[PDB]
Write a protein that binds this DNA or RNA. Structure first.
Lengths: 223, 226
DNA sequence: GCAAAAGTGTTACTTTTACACCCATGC
DNA sequence: GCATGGGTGTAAAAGTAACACTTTTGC
């Protein structure tokens, strides 16, 4: 009964869920069909529970909405402005997540009333969610340059143009193809399969995969 | 929403934990407690506390730092929320950790002594309780990155300092030696790092020129790299 | 006079950027 | 036969890293 004299708080959880399609990055967002702030756009969220760690609670939430587990997640931070939720004192912890937009479970998404939304065409979001999104992007952008988290946003196989397209999207500017492909050339953990994609191009481009094993053997990364 | 949207969920203790950096005579140190009270009485740990009803989390951090050091307006960064279940054996506490850069020469000895705290060289840390070492590792990692791309280092130095002090600081932060000539080239280009007419004698035979960080000048164009 | 820290430029090397045309294929 | 994205190399520029000796002055 040492910590007895201190108050206790609601720990919220909020998820910035990145996805990528057709050269553009989107966030999966809720168009709330429940109170508070019903009708308004927000992040997917929840509340830490007694039997779970904060990190798991995040995983839970993410899975309740997307169906996915074993997802790349990063903690964005604790947000504990006093009036950040008008209703009650909630300190929410925020995580971001990179998922593959093809692989999520639509039933669960439909039911939460959530929609993918281009990240530069974003509605106003409730509470301190825009603050959270901003910090999230900042971080993801940073980490994506020095670690291969990008590949979580693409499927297993992909074309150097899809890749380039993505990296162009994350950073918000185009880049020279010949240079880009050269850097990729020397990253051995980005491996050319003997497969080809026919549906993306007339000539059809060679598909590549990310090789976790090879990466860890020599974790150099630059784009 | 309802009373029940919230109250159906449980509530937790929110702890605060401070990694406090200082710099002296070429080496970086943390300010740590030799704990006067339980839990873990007698063991080493970070300075800590609990968020209260009437304060933001950031405020809570600022307060804690002030309680120990007497310092306000300190450079502080949030490291992260630590909320494994059994991180604190006695009870469920989710702890938000922050780091702080301060002038090891300008703090309140009387408060430090009241909390039984001591400066410890960062490469010679004792075993810290609970998940504090995890917290310290992350703090160091972040602070090192941040300091390569923003001028936070100057909070660890006094107002006037020599370019060898500054070099020493950076050699400490990155934990590796660097070239004097190259290092001073970089600093030449930072116009917000200003040479004063003042001179230090305490530190050397010849005596080196004292420099200054001009923040106003920095925020005019925030370019920084060394 | 020598120990001990201050101060000062040039050159090789590495990295980054700019840039334009042919290829294979499906329609 | 043409329209579409796939694929390729080279040179100039910028940036980074390696490198030694002279200056001051307190002891």
């Amino acid at each position: 009964n040492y910590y007895s004299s201190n108050p206790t708080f609601y720990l919220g959880i909020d998820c910035i869920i990145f996805g990528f399609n057709e050269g553009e990055i989107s966030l999966l967002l809720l168009k709330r069909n429940f109170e508070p702030a019903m009708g308004e756009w927000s992040l997917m969220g929840g509340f830490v529970q007694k039997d779970e760690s904060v990190d798991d609670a995040a995983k839970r939430v993410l899975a309740e909405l997307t169906g996915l587990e074993n997802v790349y997640m990063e903690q964005v931070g604790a947000f504990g402005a006093i009036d950040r939720d008008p209703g009650e004192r909630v300190v929410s912890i925020a995580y971001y997540a990179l998922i593959n937009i093809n692989e999520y479970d639509r039933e669960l998404v439909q039911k939460h009333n959530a929609y993918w939304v281009n990240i530069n065409e974003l509605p106003a979001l409730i509470f301190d969610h825009p603050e959270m999104v901003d910090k999230a992007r900042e971080m993801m952008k940073q980490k994506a340059s020095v670690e291969p988290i990008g590949f979580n946003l693409l499927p297993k196989l992909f074309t150097l143009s899809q890749l380039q397209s993505l990296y162009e999207a994350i950073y918000g500017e185009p880049m020279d193809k010949r240079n880009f492909r050269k850097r990729v050339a020397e990253m051995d953990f980005i491996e050319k399969t003997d497969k080809i994609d026919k549906l993306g191009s007339k000539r059809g481009a060679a598909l590549y995969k990310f090789n976790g094993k090879a990466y860890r053997k020599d974790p150099k990364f630059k784009l």
